[PDB]
């Protein structure tokens, strides 16, 4: 069901607009190297909290 | 749909193609730059300092302002002010027209 | 939503399709080899037959 945005457990602290990639245990962590980027967060989240961001 | 909060940073006009950027703890939005691939489409006027939201959903088609005359089947890209214009350079194509539009009219588009 | 397509040349069901344009109405044909297709046929469509694309 093609989702435009997901809710993924943050593997660290994530700021709004941060590009995200996979982390430990499949968690979402901040990145900076295009290739690892699968989505951009739309809200701030602390480690262990869900963060919702658009795919793209 | 999945909604989230975003703040306009430059007089968002309805039916214009939008881009976004990372701002002060918030996604900021504005009209998409000329000759690129837009991320979101406006459906409400939101001024430079106004705070609004974005409704996430894999829409089949967008209805945007035609920046010039558009023929059915034309591949479209961003133009002036976030309007949609005909092109031929694949790397800037974000969708294509399924209906005719004259400059200033809405044109339905199908995403690719 | 959906829109009218004019087919182009003997569309077969389940085959990968691609769009073009001609006289007006978007034309549909089988997608060329080694690329990205636009639509999947759900039924057979004759060369110049108008039909719908279920978006």
């Amino acid at each position: 069901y093609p989702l435009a945005a997901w809710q993924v457990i943050a593997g660290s602290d994530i700021k709004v607009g941060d590009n995200l990639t996979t982390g430990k245990d499949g968690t979402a962590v901040p990145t900076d190297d295009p290739s690892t980027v699968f989505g951009y967060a739309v809200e701030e989240a602390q480690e262990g909290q869900l963060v919702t961001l658009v795919i793209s | 749909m999945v909604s989230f909060t975003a703040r306009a940073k430059s007089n968002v006009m309805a039916y214009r193609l939008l881009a976004y950027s990372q701002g002060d703890d918030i996604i900021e939005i504005s009209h998409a730059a000329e000759n690129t691939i837009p991320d979101y489409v406006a459906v409400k006027d939101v001024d430079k300092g106004d705070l609004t939201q974005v409704n996430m959903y894999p829409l089949a088609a967008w209805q945007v302002i035609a920046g010039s005359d558009i023929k059915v089947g034309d591949n479209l890209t961003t133009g002036k002010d976030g309007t949609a214009v005909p092109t031929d350079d694949p790397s800037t194509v974000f969708g294509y027209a399924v209906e005719e539009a004259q400059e200033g009219q809405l044109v339905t588009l199908v995403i690719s | 939503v959906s829109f009218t397509a004019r087919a182009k040349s003997n569309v077969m069901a389940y085959r990968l399709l691609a769009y073009s344009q001609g006289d007006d109405i978007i034309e549909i044909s089988h997608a060329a080899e080694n690329t990205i297709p636009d639509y999947v046929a759900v039924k057979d469509v004759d060369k110049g037959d108008l039909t719908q694309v279920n978006m």
Partner: protein, 49 residues
């Protein structure tokens, strides 16, 4: 002809149906007109997708 009102339209709208006849050097615009009252709703919005 599908009118789409923004999520924050606050003023009365005019809808026109213009048919340009004659030539480009002296176009003649035959115009059908309609009016639209805008109904408030406080619907959520901003940007989508």
């Amino acid at each position: 002809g599908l009118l789409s009102v923004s999520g924050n339209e606050d003023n009365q709208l005019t809808v026109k149906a213009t048919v340009d006849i004659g030539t480009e050097d002296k176009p003649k615009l035959v115009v059908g007109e309609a009016v639209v009252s805008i109904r408030p709703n406080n619907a959520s919005g901003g940007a989508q997708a």
